[PDB]
Design a protein around this ligand. Structure first.
Ligand SMILES: Nc1ncnc2c1ncn2[C@@H]1O[C@H](COP(=O)(O)O)[C@@H](OP(=O)(O)O)[C@H]1O
Ligand SMILES: CC(C)NC[C@@H]1CCc2cc(CO)c([N+](=O)[O-])cc2N1
Length: 256
């Protein structure tokens, strides 16, 4: 097809929870739009200074009215954080999908989903290990190497609570997490008009996404398949071994 000049503003809002193919989608959207897409990896690797800003936003967000003046101050902060990006995925953004829809009325919405038990397994291996899991200690050691500490974990927890609309949450309780997952995904599909929503199951690939976005399928490029828990386990172990990201970054070309 013809090449057109795309606007550098949020065009795609992905409401999918972590461990549902968000990093592959981030990569896919960057392949399509040639501009950056937000993801937790953008925070970890490029903008750790954004952590406190996301924290402050989540703190003030109860004050959001489904526009009031308190709402506008928050919406302005959201726009500031996302300036220069063409899409959002992953925590901490995903819980804000409804607000992002108001801020970017011409953006389309995605929902990434998968088998709930596969999701929980993946989540426990990477994002939210049980407190008694020895692996949690390795994750914390690798996080230290990346310069992530208690503030990062607070952002992860608070943004999960915000997405699930819980004031507190037993993170070690599998049943609680699975119920929140199902209710979260159900609410997105109830909230977003079907014409503005595309639901993507893990493995769906380029075709329905490119159709929804009115773009050609990228020539000769496979749909990304990155960020498996096995790959993150390798990353964690290599970070612990070398004590730096930059010593090993070349060994993870598309993941980071
Ligand atoms: N193109 C693809 N096809 C199938 N699974 C994919 C995929 N891209 C990513 N995934 C899976 O999506 C999960 C990562 O999601 P996210 O980037 O949101 O954290 C991983 O699940 P597993 O940990 O079960 O392997 C990864 O394997
Ligand atoms: C040892 C090192 C590999 N650990 C860092 C990890 C890996 C990637 C990651 C991804 C997400 C959501 O994509 C979240 N999250 O939900 O906040 C936390 C983390 N933390």
């Amino acid at each position: 097809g013809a090449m057109i000049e795309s606007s550098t503003t949020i065009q795609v809002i992905s409401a999918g929870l972590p461990r549902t193919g968000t990093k592959s989608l981030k990569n896919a959207l960057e392949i399509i739009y040639h501009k950056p897409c937000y993801h937790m990896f953008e925070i970890i690797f490029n903008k750790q200074s954004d952590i406190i800003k996301w924290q402050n936003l989540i703190h003030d967000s109860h004050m959001i009215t489904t526009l009031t003046t308190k709402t506008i101050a928050i919406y302005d902060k959201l726009k500031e954080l996302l300036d220069g990006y063409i899409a959002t995925t992953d925590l901490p953004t995903c819980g804000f999908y409804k607000d992002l829809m108001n801020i970017y009325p011409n953006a389309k919405v995605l929902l990434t989903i998968r088998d709930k038990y596969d999701w929980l397994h993946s989540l426990r291996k990477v994002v939210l290990p049980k407190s008694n899991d020895p692996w949690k200690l390795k994750i914390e050691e690798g996080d230290k190497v990346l310069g992530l500490n208690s503030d990062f974990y607070k952002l992860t927890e608070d943004s999960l609570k915000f997405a699930f609309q819980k004031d507190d949450l037993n993170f070690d309780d599998d049943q609680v997490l699975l119920e929140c997952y199902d209710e979260y995904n159900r609410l997105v599909q109830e909230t977003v008009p079907s014409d503005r929503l595309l639901v993507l199951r893990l493995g769906d690939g380029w075709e329905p996404l490119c159709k929804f976005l009115n773009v050609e399928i990228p020539n000769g490029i496979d749909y990304p398949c990155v960020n498996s828990h096995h790959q993150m386990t390798q990353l964690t172990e290599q970070l612990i071994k070398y004590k730096s990201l930059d010593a090993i970054i070349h060994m993870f070309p598309d993941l980071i």
